[PDB]
Amino acid sequence: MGPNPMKMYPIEGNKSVQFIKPILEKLENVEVGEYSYYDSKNGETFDKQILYHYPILNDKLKIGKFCSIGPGVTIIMNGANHRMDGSTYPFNLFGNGWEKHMPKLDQLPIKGDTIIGNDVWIGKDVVIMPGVKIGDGAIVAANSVVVKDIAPYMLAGGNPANEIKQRFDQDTINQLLDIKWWNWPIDIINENIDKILDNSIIREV
Amino acid sequence: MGPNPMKMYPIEGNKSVQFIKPILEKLENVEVGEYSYYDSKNGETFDKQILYHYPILNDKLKIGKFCSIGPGVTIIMNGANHRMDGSTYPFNLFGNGWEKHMPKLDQLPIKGDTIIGNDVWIGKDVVIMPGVKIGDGAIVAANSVVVKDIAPYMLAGGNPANEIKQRFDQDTINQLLDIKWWNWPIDIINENIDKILDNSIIREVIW
Amino acid sequence: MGPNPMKMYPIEGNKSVQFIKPILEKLENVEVGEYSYYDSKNGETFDKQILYHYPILNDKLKIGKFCSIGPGVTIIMNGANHRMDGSTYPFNLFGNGWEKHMPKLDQLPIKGDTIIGNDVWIGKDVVIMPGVKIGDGAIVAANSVVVKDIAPYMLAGGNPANEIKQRFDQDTINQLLDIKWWNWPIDIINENIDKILDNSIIREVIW
Numbered sequence: 001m002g003p004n005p006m007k008m009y010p011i012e013g014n015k016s017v018q019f020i021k022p023i024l025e026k027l028e029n030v031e032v033g034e035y036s037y038y039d040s041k042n043g044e045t046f047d048k049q050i051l052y053h054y055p056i057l058n059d060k061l062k063i064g065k066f067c068s069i070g071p072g073v074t075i076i077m078n079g080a081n082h083r084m085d086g087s088t089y090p091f092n093l094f095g096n097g098w099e100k101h102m103p104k105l106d107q108l109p110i111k112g113d114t115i116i117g118n119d120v121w122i123g124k125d126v127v128i129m130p131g132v133k134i135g136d137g138a139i140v141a142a143n144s145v146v147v148k149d150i151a152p153y154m155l156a157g158g159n160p161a162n163e164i165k166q167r168f169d170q171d172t173i174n175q176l177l178d179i180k181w182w183n184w185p186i187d188i189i190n191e192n193i194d195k196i197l198d199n200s201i202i203r204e205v
Numbered sequence: 206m207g208p209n210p211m212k213m214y215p216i217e218g219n220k221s222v223q224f225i226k227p228i229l230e231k232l233e234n235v236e237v238g239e240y241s242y243y244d245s246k247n248g249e250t251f252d253k254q255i256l257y258h259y260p261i262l263n264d265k266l267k268i269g270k271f272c273s274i275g276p277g278v279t280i281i282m283n284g285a286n287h288r289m290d291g292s293t294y295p296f297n298l299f300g301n302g303w304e305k306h307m308p309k310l311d312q313l314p315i316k317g318d319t320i321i322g323n324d325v326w327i328g329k330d331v332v333i334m335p336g337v338k339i340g341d342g343a344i345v346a347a348n349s350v351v352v353k354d355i356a357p358y359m360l361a362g363g364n365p366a367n368e369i370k371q372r373f374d375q376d377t378i379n380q381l382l383d384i385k386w387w388n389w390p391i392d393i394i395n396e397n398i399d400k401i402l403d404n405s406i407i408r409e410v411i412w
Numbered sequence: 413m414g415p416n417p418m419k420m421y422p423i424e425g426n427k428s429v430q431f432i433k434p435i436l437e438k439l440e441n442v443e444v445g446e447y448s449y450y451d452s453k454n455g456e457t458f459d460k461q462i463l464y465h466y467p468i469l470n471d472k473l474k475i476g477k478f479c480s481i482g483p484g485v486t487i488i489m490n491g492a493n494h495r496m497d498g499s500t501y502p503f504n505l506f507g508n509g510w511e512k513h514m515p516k517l518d519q520l521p522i523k524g525d526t527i528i529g530n531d532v533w534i535g536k537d538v539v540i541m542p543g544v545k546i547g548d549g550a551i552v553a554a555n556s557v558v559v560k561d562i563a564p565y566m567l568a569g570g571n572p573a574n575e576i577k578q579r580f581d582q583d584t585i586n587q588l589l590d591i592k593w594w595n596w597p598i599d600i601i602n603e604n605i606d607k608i609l610d611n612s613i614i615r616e617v618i619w
Contacts, residue, residue, distance in 0.1 A: 001302040010299050017298065035294070066294040068287065076554065080536075082480065084579070086611035087593075088533040088551060089447070089478045093429070094422050097413035101605045121293040124285075125332075127555050139293060142281065143332050143350045143364060145555045147569070157352070159364040159555060159571040167289070181292075193306045199291040206509035215506050222505070240501075271501045273494065326500040329492075330539075344500060347488065348539050348557045348571060362559070364571040372496070386499075398513050404498035 001190045005034040016040040020063060023047055028055045033065030033118060033182075041071035041124075052079030059110055064118030064136065065182045072125035081109045081130065117152065118182040137167065137176060152177060168199070175202050206395050210239040221245045225268065228252050233260045238270025238323060238387070246276030246329075257284025264315050264335070269323030270387045275347065277330040283315045286335065322357065323387040341382060342372065357382055373404070380407045413602050417446040428452045432475060435459060440467050445477030445530060445594070453483035464491030469522060471542070476530035477594045482554060484537040493521040493542070529564065530594040549579065549588060564589060580611075587614045 003010035008022040017039055021032040023046055030050070038046040050061065051074060059078045082088040083103050092102035111131030116122075120134055123142030134140065134150045141157030141164075150156045153173045154163045166173065181189060181196050195201035208215035213227045221244060226237040228250055235255075243251040255266065256279065264283045287293040288308050297307040316336025321327070325339055328347030333339075338354045345351065346362030346369075355361045358372040358381065371378070386394060386401050400406040415422040420434045429451055433444045435458050442462070450458040462473060463486065471490045494500040495515050504514035523543025528534075532546055535554030546552065547564030557571035565585045567577040578585070593601060593608050607613040 002296075003299040003301050003303070010301075066292065068294060070285075076536075080482075082533055082551075083609065084551070086607075086609045086613070087478065087531050087549075088480060089531060090480065091414075091605050091609070094415040096415045096422075097602070098415070098605070101609065119292050119294060121287055129554070137292075139289070141352075142334070145364075145571075147553070157365065159350070159557075160569065190302075193296050193303070195291075197288060197291040197296070197306060201291075207503075208506040208508050208510075271499065273500055273502065324499050324501060326494055344494075344496070346559075347492075347541070350571075362572065364557070395509075398503050398510070402495065402498045402503070402513060406498075 002186065003035075010037070016043060018046060020046050020067075020069070024050075027053075029053065029058065030061045030063075032063045033067065035065050036063050036067035036069065038069045038073075039071050039124075049073060050075045051077065053077035054079045056105070057108075057110065059130070060113040062113065063116045064120065066119045067116065068121045070122055070124035070126065070142065073122050073128070074126075075114060075128045076130055077114065078108075078110050078130045081111070083107050084109060118180075123157075136182075137173075139167065172199065172202060175205070179205050207391065215242070220248065223251060225251050225272075225274070229255075229268070232258075234258070234263065234265040235267075236265065237268045238272065240270050240387075241268055241272035241274065243274045243278070244276045244329075254278060255280050256282065258282035259284040261310070262313070262315065265318045267318060267320040269321060269325065269341065271324045272321060273326040275327055275329035275331065278327050278333070279331070280319060280333045281335055282319065283313075283335045286313060286315070288312055323385075341387075342378070344372065377404065377407060380411050384410050414598060415447075422449070427455060430458060432458050432479075432481065436462075439465070441465070441470065441472040442475075443472065444475040445479065447477055448475055448479035448481065450481045450485075451483045461485060462487045463489065465489035466491040469517070469520070471522060472525045473528075474525060475528040476532065476548065478531045479528060480533045482534055482536040482538065485534050486537075486539045487526060488539065488541055489526065490520075490522045490542045493523075495519055496521060530592075535569075548594075549585070551579070584611070584614060587618050591617050593617075 008018055009015055010019055011017050017037055020036045020038055021034055024030045024032045057078050091098045115133040117134055117136035119137050122140045125143050126140050127145045129147045132146050135152030137153035138150050139155045144157045144161040145159035146161045153167045155165050155167055156163045192201055210224055211227060213223055214220055215224050216222055223243050225241045225243050226239050229235050229237045262283050296303040320338045322339055322341035324341055325343050327345045331345050331349045333351045337351050340355055340357030342358035343355050344360050349362050349366040350364035352365045358378045360369045360372055362369055386406055397406055417431055418434050420430055421427055422431050423429050429449055432448045432450050433446055436442050436444050439459060469490050503510040527545040529546055529548035531549050533551045535552050537555050538552050539557045541559050544558050545561045547562055549565035550562050551567050553569030556569045556573040559572040562568045565579045566575045567579060568575045593613055604613055
């Protein structure tokens, strides 16, 4: 019951809704969760949505399970950070004698890994900046520019994106982070979808 | 005198500027004013800029007259709101048995309809969110994201968009909201464009 | 040593990165510095990134030297401002008798010249509005919408962009502003690229 999480394109006949895991497996420094899908903008594959990601830099991108990524969402890793101790001008880029002035890896600023929780909804055209972490259950409004962390089960938006409000009271939130239904076996989940959909799954747990 | 409001491309030999009524009118749950235009960004027709609008959700989009809509402006309707009382994951979308957990219309509430007033100037690449109302005379800055209502004759901007300032004093605005020149027959408007252009149209009618 | 600032495409076999100066020699009321470059988003030339620039209005765009313009940066000039003392509707635009209502230059808003300093790093998809000045050494974060001036050596971002942080303390900034290494004959620059890169240039030139 349910789609094949190994299938790149879960909906037969439809090449717009895609499962990220299959696609990003061929890539390094990227761990993706089962059932997270990307809703193509112009029929593009989610791998083009990840910019400036280089193995040599070693920063990682992690995405949880049951994530809904809207069309146009872009993820910016650290490969485009400029050295900022002095001038930001990439002299080395233009060779002809300038390559000699090339940064040492420890000279380029790395803001860290980018982590996206489970059951996270990212609206369309959302831009996510280097080294950000979006907690489980969070909802990132459309056209947001995420530059700082967002807390679990928080509704957020803007440029810079800011937390607007908690999706539920703290105890309801607290419990969901404990249950972690997204880590339940496919069959147990398939047997509680509706309780998970209306948050009533909390009571029986 | 003046263009034909029924023409899709008012300006001869020009496929960039379009009159929005001829185009949208052809659609469901949409009302548009006669002279409002759209300055195409890449040649697209304004109908391509209205996203997630589904008859079944029954939300309407209203656009007044004499509106200036910049290129790339995007209007988001309620067709893509995920259920939110629990998980936001669209299980039903992937069928294969998950289609039974499909939302019942009353589990997908909406804030309201989207209404853009008359004589509104919306800058380029502005994104308009569901259930928002923009007042007559308002000016929305380029690249703004409208998430809440904007009052009549206000200057607003940003992401989220915020009201920056009032365009005129309160009386000029209330007088204007009264006169509603955009509602006059074409012939009477043609006679005062300059007065409507410099706002002196208030002293002629009012006084 | 160092690239020829006159080459449109400095990096051999690579039509993505361009030196803005040679590429914009043709445009009017535009001044650009020698090593400023653009990082093309989809192959487009930078001249395509400057919008609503009409000589008639006479506003100018100035871009200093050694600037890093990220892909998709958009510079909006004054040719897009509507008349605002009354209706913002551009009747004159549709002709058919309406052209007569065409604005006299002095009736049209015009925020001034746009000025980008030296050694300025402008992030991806940044939109620069009209009449804005960006000080030397500033860094603009990707996706910002710059509506107001940005002081020298400041870190700014958002929509509207706000100054987030001073890169260095005031005296270091002032020294850098006084030294102006970007105005040095390239020979001298070439022998100090590394001191310019770690800021040790201040210590040697000031004391």
